[PDB]
Amino acid sequence: AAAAAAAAAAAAAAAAAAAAAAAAAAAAAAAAAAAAAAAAAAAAAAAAAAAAAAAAAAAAAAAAAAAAAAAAAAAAAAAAAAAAAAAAAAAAAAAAAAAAAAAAAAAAAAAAAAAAAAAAAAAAAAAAAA
Amino acid sequence: MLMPRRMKYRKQQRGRLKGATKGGDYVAFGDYGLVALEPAWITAQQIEAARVAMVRHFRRGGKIFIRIFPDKPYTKKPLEVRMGKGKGNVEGYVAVVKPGRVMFEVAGVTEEQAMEALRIAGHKLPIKTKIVRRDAYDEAQ
Amino acid sequence: KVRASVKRICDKCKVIRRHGRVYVICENPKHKQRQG
Amino acid sequence: KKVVAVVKLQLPAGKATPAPPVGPALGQHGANIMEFVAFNAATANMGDAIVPVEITIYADRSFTFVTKTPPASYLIRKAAGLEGRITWEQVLEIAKQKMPDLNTTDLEAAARMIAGSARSMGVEVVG
Amino acid sequence: YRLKAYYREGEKPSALRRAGKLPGVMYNRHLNRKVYVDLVEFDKVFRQASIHHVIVLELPDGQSLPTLVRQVNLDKRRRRPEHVDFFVLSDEPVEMYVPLRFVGTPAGVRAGGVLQEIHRDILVKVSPRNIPEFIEVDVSGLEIGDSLHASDLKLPPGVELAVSPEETIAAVVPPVEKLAEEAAAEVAEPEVIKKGKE
Amino acid sequence: IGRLPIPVPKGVSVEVAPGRVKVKGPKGELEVPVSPEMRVVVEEGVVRVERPSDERRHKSLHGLTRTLIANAVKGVSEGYSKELLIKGIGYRARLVGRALELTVGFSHPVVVEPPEGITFEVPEPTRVRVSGIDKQKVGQVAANIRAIRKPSAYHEKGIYYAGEPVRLKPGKA
Amino acid sequence: PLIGFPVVDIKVTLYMAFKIAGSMAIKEAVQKGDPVILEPIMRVEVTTPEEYMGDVIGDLNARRGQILGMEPRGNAQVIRAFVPLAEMFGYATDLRSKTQGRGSFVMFFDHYQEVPKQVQEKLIK
RNA sequence: CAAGUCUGGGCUAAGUGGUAAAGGAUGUGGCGCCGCGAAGACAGCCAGGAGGUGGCUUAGAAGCAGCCAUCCUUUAAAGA
């Protein structure tokens, strides 16, 4: 059986595009509002991406397979990862701290990230939004 | 129902249900078939009950192939008479069927349908039956 | 309830053997069977 | 005395009667169930076609309501002499009329939702 | 398609079958040798291969021969093979059975009704350099009566049919509303060919 | 199986014979039968159970045996519980002594003396909880109570487990 | 011919003495014409709190009916339908059981129409 | 009731053995040969399961009466 295949091929390209992957937990509200943080965070991020919400334990074995070195401060959990490798991001996360932070019982959480290429912390990133 | 239109002889001897099938044993037309696991005289009314149940199940659609044909006369003496006085009158007609005979065969329907239809029909038969698809039945040469 | 071919009727229906013999039970009680 | 609401009704064009579902859901609203028949002013233009609506109440016992666009199967029936066919542009015209609703904000995508609704009513798309 | 095959001397075809081995034979104008194969390995291959595609026979020595199956003899009771005749190919226009691929939706199935694939093979003369797979067949014209056949089929180069043609290869045919006229019918009265004087 | 390793807490002694296994603790002691086809004896900070072979007899008794234990261990650190709703008009429950007097529309109220090891509460007058060390006993008495006036079957009458019922949407009528 | 009730809804085209001939002609035409029994159908509108609608309608269908529609009237809800007069016996008390005595209904002759091929034999009787 | 409570390996748990068929069945043991599994659902469990919203008939058929068609959208993934 396949030990990391056509799903790595898409994640280790769409996330081997640049060096600013930002990681989040996003599954926990009605998809009306979910398919409108993802169609809405196109108003702050480029190409055609808000998140790739794909398999941790395949997001894990790609950030290592493609040299990009551990996002392993939060690589566990329900990991959605707002890929800003194909994006126009810096304060695009600044415009991602309202619509699912101050909206729900905490709808979209930060977790781990890459600033240019060296690794951005959790609260030193979360607070970086304001 | 189903019975010869003409005949040289009106009554025939009972004979035997022997091995084999002789022929009739690979599919040939449809995608699925119903094969006989035991010998038996299959009556015209059995074949018909079967065929009809077959069509109820695919209400419009599909084709049914009836590969057996009852051309053997079933005799039975009048009720409560004795032995002798000659051979009984024909009560009906049977098709002789030995193990491995493909009896029915359907096509033009889903697997779900043919399975289900052939199961029903085979419930109308006096014998154990198996259903089949199309393997080594490419029995051209 | 009591007959010779005991089959599952619905999806929730559950074949069980017990006290010797084969039962069925769906959540819907009409489907409750026993061989006999 | 009733509490708050975000009512998601679904009323057609013209016949606006306080009859349910404009009764059980809008009895906790104090809703002007006749300040809708506001509607046939904006849809005195159109004429037909259902118009979705969301009526929200507050504390002082006042109401509100914003409406979406008419069924995707509507504009397609008139654009074919139906109760026919539409070109690769006449599909790209309609996907504009409902682009602030569907989900996509494209037309290579949006049009296909319309082109899909083509075989939903048996109406070929002129190529 | 490969298939480990072996050589049979002169000992009782019952045993092999009993073992697990489908007894058989390869032959052609030149050759003729008794051989068995694994029944279980032979079934895996012959289900995809059928008589249509070439099966290669790897003997003990390493000699891989391409072969077509000419004949598989069944058991009747148990739809089960008893024997294979392997035809060993050479430099030859050989006669063989090539799949038709009925591709298209016939306009007479869309109109209710059924495609009866009379023939799923046609018998062709052809040299083993060019064994086609499919011979795909234009179907989509056929309305719920008419029935294309013979050579109304595109034949790739050097391929040429050793049938008639005329031999019918496909009909589309009519498919519960007629079970009343059927049940009613209850007619005829079986007639005995008059023997006798006259 | 669910032959994981169990987990002995605070003040539980876990004795062990060839056929049995005693479990002491803050809420009491319990004797727990066991197939001698498994070999458990008073084990570490946690109790573990193996089986000789992987026959079907065996696998079955495993887990069966681990659970029997485990329920015993939870019994003795407070494993009482499971409560009864009585639903419907005149129906209500009170304690008379330790014994339990349900009025449920029969002509006289029924009383239910609680067996050994088992205690009845009646917080509300229509909620009722059965409390014991054992477990299978709690279950048994739970059911005897329930079966005094079972639900439903056309109404929201009778006495229920907390964990809820269908109604048969019947002849109004 | 069948039960002996009036014959209706037919066009005769002609192409003491005269009397006996029409009388024996048509008497026969109706047999050769291969007849069918018609039976009164009442237009019914029943009025029910909406609670009960499904069961009410279900029972109308069970009465061999054909529902025609449903509007409100004030606090409750009306259902219009056609049902054969025959199956409408004791309707009011069946209805009252299905509506906890809150339903009412009214009934007016509407048309005649042929039967369900079950009766007739069970009506030549 | 004369001679093995003989030896080695299986099966059976019904007193089957020690009375019967179609048929039914997580009985049990064994042989297959296909899937799935460091692209960590097998089972439980926590989420999601959504847009276009469907054509027809029918009083009403809107994923679910029964008939034609199974076409896209945003997707992690959601069947007309």
Curated annotation (Swiss-Prot), chain C:
Provide the GO MF annotations for this entry: metal ion binding; structural constituent of ribosome
Name the PROSITE patterns for this protein: RIBOSOMAL_L36
Record's keyword terms, sorted? Metal-binding, Ribonucleoprotein, Ribosomal protein, Zinc
What protein does this entry describe?
Large ribosomal subunit protein bL36
What InterPro entries is this protein classified in? Ribosomal_bL36, Ribosomal_bL36_sp
Question: How far does the signal peptide extend, from start to end residue?
Answer: none
The scientific name of the source species is Thermus thermophilus (strain ATCC 27634 / DSM 579 / HB8)
UniProt xrefs under Pfam families: Ribosomal_L36
- Family statement drawn from the similarity comment of this UniProt entry: Belongs to the bacterial ribosomal protein bL36 family.
> How is this protein organized at the quaternary level?
Part of the 50S ribosomal subunit.
One GO CC annotation, please?
ribonucleoprotein complex
NCBIfam families noted in UniProt = rpmJ_bact
Q: Which cofactor does it need?
A: Zn(2+)
Q: Name one GO biological process term.
A: translation
What does this protein's record comment on cofactor binding?
Answer: Binds 1 zinc ion per subunit.
Q: Which domain of life is it from?
A: Bacteria
Q: Which PANTHER family match?
A: 50S RIBOSOMAL PROTEIN L36, CHLOROPLASTIC (PTHR42888), LARGE RIBOSOMAL SUBUNIT PROTEIN BL36C (PTHR42888:SF1)
UniProtKB/Swiss-Prot annotation, chain E:
For this protein, the record's Pfam families field holds: Ribosomal_L25p (PF01386), Ribosomal_TL5_C (PF14693)
Q: What are the record keywords, sorted?
A: Ribonucleoprotein, Ribosomal protein, RNA-binding, rRNA-binding
| Cited HAMAP family | Ribosomal_bL25_CTC (MF_01334)
Q: Which GO terms describe its biological process?
A: translation
Name the segments for region: Disordered: 180-198
Q: Where is the composition biased (Basic and acidic residues)?
A: 191-198
Q: What is this protein called?
A: Large ribosomal subunit protein bL25
Q: Which domain of life is it from?
A: Bacteria
Describe the protein's quaternary organization and the partners it interacts with: Part of the 50S ribosomal subunit. Contacts the 5S rRNA; has been isolated in a complex with 5S rRNA and uL5, 5S rRNA and DNA binding protein II; 5S rRNA and uL18; 5S rRNA, uL5 and DNA binding protein II.
**Species assigned in the record:** Thermus thermophilus (strain ATCC 27634 / DSM 579 / HB8)
One GO location term (cellular component) = cytosolic large ribosomal subunit
Question: Which Gene3D superfamilies does the record match to this protein?
Answer: Ribosomal protein L25, beta domain, Ribosomal Protein L25, Chain P
Question: What CDD domains does the entry give?
Answer: Ribosomal_L25_TL5_CTC (cd00495)
Ranked from the top, the taxonomy reads: Bacteria, Thermotogati, Deinococcota, Deinococci, Thermales
Q: Tell me the GO molecular function terms.
A: 5S rRNA binding; structural constituent of ribosome
Q: Family assignment?
A: Belongs to the bacterial ribosomal protein bL25 family. CTC subfamily.
What this chain does, per the record? This is one of 3 proteins that mediate the attachment of the 5S rRNA onto the large ribosomal subunit.
Q: Which InterPro entries match?
A: Rbsml_bL25/Gln-tRNA_synth_N, Ribosomal_bL25/Gln-tRNA_synth, Ribosomal_bL25_b-dom, Ribosomal_bL25_C, Ribosomal_bL25_long, Ribosomal_L25_dom, Ribosomal_uL5_bac-type
From Swiss-Prot, chain F:
Keyword list (alphabetical) reads: Ribonucleoprotein, Ribosomal protein, RNA-binding, rRNA-binding
- Give the record's GO biological process terms: cytoplasmic translation
In terms of InterPro entries, this protein maps to: Ribosomal_uL6-like (IPR000702), Ribosomal_uL6-like_a/b-dom_sf (IPR036789), Ribosomal_uL6_a/b-dom (IPR020040), Ribosomal_uL6_bac-type (IPR019906)
Could you confirm whether the keyword RNA-binding appears in this record?
Answer: yes
* Record-annotated membrane-spanning stretches: none
What GO CC terms are in its UniProt record? cytosolic large ribosomal subunit
Molecular function per GO:
rRNA binding; structural constituent of ribosome
Q: Record's Pfam families?
A: Ribosomal_L6
Its assembly, as annotated, is: Part of the 50S ribosomal subunit.
What is the stated purpose of this protein? This protein binds to the 23S rRNA, and is important in its secondary structure. It is located near the subunit interface in the base of the L7/L12 stalk, and near the tRNA binding site of the peptidyltransferase center.
Q: Which HAMAP family match?
A: Ribosomal_uL6_B (MF_01365_B)
Q: Which family does it belong to?
A: Belongs to the universal ribosomal protein uL6 family.
The record, for NCBIfam families, names:
L6_bact
Which PANTHER family does the record associate with it?
A: 60S/50S RIBOSOMAL PROTEIN L6/L9, LARGE RIBOSOMAL SUBUNIT PROTEIN UL6M
Name of the protein this chain belongs to = Large ribosomal subunit protein uL6
What taxonomic classification does the UniProt entry list for its organism?
Bacteria, Thermotogati, Deinococcota, Deinococci, Thermales
UniProtKB/Swiss-Prot annotation, chain G:
Q: Which residues of the full protein are shown?
A: 554 to 689 of 691
Cleaved signal peptide residues: none
| Lineage: superkingdom | Bacteria
State its location(s): Cytoplasm
Family membership noted in the UniProt record: Belongs to the TRAFAC class translation factor GTPase superfamily. Classic translation factor GTPase family. EF-G/EF-2 subfamily.
Q: What is this protein called?
A: Elongation factor G
Q: What species does this protein belong to?
A: Thermus thermophilus (strain ATCC 27634 / DSM 579 / HB8)
**Function description:** Catalyzes the GTP-dependent ribosomal translocation step during translation elongation. During this step, the ribosome changes from the pre-translocational (PRE) to the post-translocational (POST) state as the newly formed A-site-bound peptidyl-tRNA and P-site-bound deacylated tRNA move to the P and E sites, respectively. Catalyzes the coordinated movement of the two tRNA molecules, the mRNA and conformational changes in the ribosome.
